[PDB]
Paper text:
Of note, to facilitate the crystallization of F34D, a small flexible loop (residues 57-68) was removed (CLIC5–Δloop). Importantly, a comparison of the CLIC5-WT with or without this loop revealed no functional or structural perturbation. Similar to other CLIC proteins, CLIC5-Δloop-F34D consists of tightly packed TRX and α domains, connected by a flexible linker. Despite the marked functional effect conferred by the F34D mutation, the static high-resolution structure of the compact conformation reveals no significant differences between WT and F34D. In contrast to the crystalline environment, CLICs exhibit structural flexibility in solution, with an elongated conformation in which the inter-domain interface is exposed. First, to assess the structural effects of acidic pH on protein dynamics, leading to enhanced membrane fusion, we compared the HDX profile of CLIC5-WT at pH 7.5 and 5.546. Under acidic conditions, the TRX domain, as well as the interfacial region of the α domain, exhibit markedly increased deuterium uptake. This increase likely reflects increased exposure to the bulk. Thus, our pH-dependence HDX-MS analyses support a population shift mechanism, skewing the conformational distribution towards the elongated form. Importantly, the transition to the elongated conformation involves the exposure of the hydrophobic inter-domain interface to the bulk, providing a mechanistic paradigm for the triggering event necessary for membrane interaction, initiating membrane fusion.
Chloride Intracellular Channel (CLIC) family members uniquely transition between soluble and membrane-associated conformations. Here, we expose the function of CLIC5 as a fusogen. We demonstrate that purified CLIC5 directly interacts with the membrane and induces fusion, as reflected by increased liposomal diameter and lipid and content mixing between liposomes. Moreover, we show that this activity is facilitated by acidic pH, a known trigger for CLICs’ transition to a membrane-associated conformation, and that increased exposure of the hydrophobic inter-domain interface is crucial for this process.
Numbering used by the authors: 25 to 251
């Protein structure tokens, strides 16, 4: 549990944080562990973020996640794994539906691709509004018999949030910029969750700027040119 050097994507100015949900994932985990670590922004290009632990390189973000959760343990470090399996699968198809949506150039497919994104957002909204069994037991449910928990697994950030929140933020920023798409406000559980994340330094201070996320997709997101 020493000598941790994180390497994340650099923004256009060479110093600030670039757009990379996987970089922010690892940045959030390390921060939420309370471990001492340094972070460096580098070009990276198409390469994934990575870290060194006591001078040994660790690669592959999912393997890095397991290594950190197994190496930084109680009592000195908190366990961050979600306790509910549904927390690990909630929202899993959102990024892929968003990507297919912003990449299509045919106006004929836009409505179906938008409904697919909206539906995948709605399943995530349902999970965040359905009370977890401990909330029902604790009678901590909202007056509407709905969940008021702050994040996927409970009121604490878990590894599943470190995965999903960077991607969901990118979806919000990019779908708005390049399709004028708004995550419906009636998705109150999804919006409660995003705003809970925006209120936490661990997300906000590891986040790439709005302009950075939008510019990073300027070649990826396509205009509805063809019919």
């Amino acid at each position: 549990a020493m000598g941790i050097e994180l390497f994340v994507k650099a923004g256009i100015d060479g110093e600030s944080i670039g757009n990379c949900p996987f970089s922010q994932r690892l940045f959030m985990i390390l921060w939420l562990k309370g471990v001492v670590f340094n972070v460096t922004t580098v070009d990276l290009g198409t390469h994934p973020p990575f870290l060194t632990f006591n001078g040994d390189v660790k690669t592959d973000v999912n393997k890095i996640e397991e290594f950190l959760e197994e190496t930084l343990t109680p009592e000195k470090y908190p366990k961050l794994a979600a306790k509910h399996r549904e927390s690990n699968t909630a929202g899993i198809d959102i990024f892929s539906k968003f990507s297919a949506y912003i990449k299509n150039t045919k106006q004929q497919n836009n409505a179906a691709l938008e409904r697919g994104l909206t539906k995948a957002l709605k399943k995530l909204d349902d999970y965040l509004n359905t009370p977890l069994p401990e909330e029902i037991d604790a009678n901590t449910c909202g007056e509407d018999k709905g969940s008021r928990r702050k994040f996927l697994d409970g009121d604490e950030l878990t590894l599943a949030d470190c995965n999903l929140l960077p991607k969901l933020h990118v979806v919000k920023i990019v779908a708005k910029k390049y399709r004028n798409y708004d995550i419906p406000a009636e998705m109150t559980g999804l919006w409660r969750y995003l705003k809970n994340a925006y209120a936490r330094d661990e997300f906000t201070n590891t986040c790439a700027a709005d302009s950075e996320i939008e510019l990073a997709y300027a070649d990826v997101a396509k205009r509805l040119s063809r019919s």
